[PDB]
Amino acid sequence: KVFGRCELAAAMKRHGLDNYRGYSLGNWVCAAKFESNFNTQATNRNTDGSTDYGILQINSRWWCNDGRTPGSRNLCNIPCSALLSSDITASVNCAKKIVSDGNGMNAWVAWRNRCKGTDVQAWIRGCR
Ligand SMILES: C[C@@H](O)CN1CCN(CC(=O)O)CCN(CC(=O)O)CCN(CC(=O)O)CC1
Ligand SMILES: C[C@@H](O)CN1CCN(CC(=O)O)CCN(CC(=O)O)CCN(CC(=O)O)CC1
Ligand SMILES: [Cl-]
Ligand SMILES: [Cl-]
Ligand SMILES: [Cl-]
Ligand SMILES: [Gd]
Ligand code: NA
């Protein structure tokens, strides 16, 4: 699924993501735009053999199992294939663990370089 800006905000807000670990809702829509272009099915191969999956591009090295990332962890306890669903439940619950893990939203390279220190509220502007 390719999500609208307002449509994704309402879904992230309903799955409790709004102000999670002090990160306002704008930081999260910001990250999804530049990680996936709001596309749940996005995949990107990394040079180490791991792959990033879904709207927040969650990495197979630590967080889920795609059966081709040798001696890797599955700390979400999910197949990576579940992170590609039109339903963002899996991606949100998985993200709650990552952003809690010590490094906050810096774990997302596109948030750090394109959202951190910007007017992030702009990303939910006009939505009900
Ligand atoms: C809502 C409208 O803006 C729709 N929009 C009309 C055309 N816009 C004109 C403008 O944005 O004033 C210029 C192109 N636009 C640039 C950008 O927005 O970054 C990219 C395409 N957009 C992406 C999006 O908006 O989600 C969809 C089409
Ligand atoms: C031409 C306009 O599109 C200018 N635009 C600024 C104003 N936009 C307009 C809007 O999207 O209605 C509102 C904020 N916008 C939200 C979003 O687009 O997702 C994020 C910033 N954008 C990023 C981008 O466009 O890729 C910068 C360019
Ligand atoms: Cl915000
Ligand atoms: Cl594996
Ligand atoms: Cl933090
Ligand atoms: Gd924009
Ligand atoms: Na893994």
Q: How many whole angstroms separate alpha carbon 107 and alpha carbon 128?
A: 29
Tokens found for residue 65: 């199992």
Token representation of residue 68: 């081709």
- Which residue's entry shows tokens 């996936």? 36
Ligand 2: which of 12, 36, 125 to mutate, judged by most atoms within 8 Å of the beta carbon? 125
40, 86 Cβ separation under 8 angstroms: yes
Residue boundaries of the structural domains of the chain: 1-128
Active site residues: 35, 52
Resolution, expressed in angstroms to one decimal: 2.3
Q: How many Å lie between the centroid of ligand 5 and the Cα of residue 105?
A: 7
Q: Is the CB of 123 under 6 A from ligand 2?
A: yes
- Which parts of 20-112 are beta strand (E)? 43-45, 51-53, 58-59
Method of structure determination: X-ray
Contacts of 103 (CB under 8 A, 6+ apart): none
CATH number for 1-128 (one of 1.10.530.10, 1.10.150.240, 3.30.365.10, 3.90.950.20): it is 1.10.530.10
- Dist CA 86 CA 41 (whole Å): 8
Taking the centre of ligand 4 as the mean of its atom positions, its distance from the CA of residue 88, in whole angstroms, is 23
Biggest CA pair distance of the chain: 46
Q: How far apart are CA 93 and CA 117, in angstroms?
A: 25
Burial of 54 (0-12, 13-18, 19+ CB in 10 A): buried
- Cβ atoms 34, 70 nearer than 8 A: no
Residue 111, SS3 per DSSP: helix
**Following DSSP, what letter does each residue of 5-41 receive, concatenated?**
HHHHHHHHHHTT-TTBTTB-HHHHHHHHHHHHSSBTT
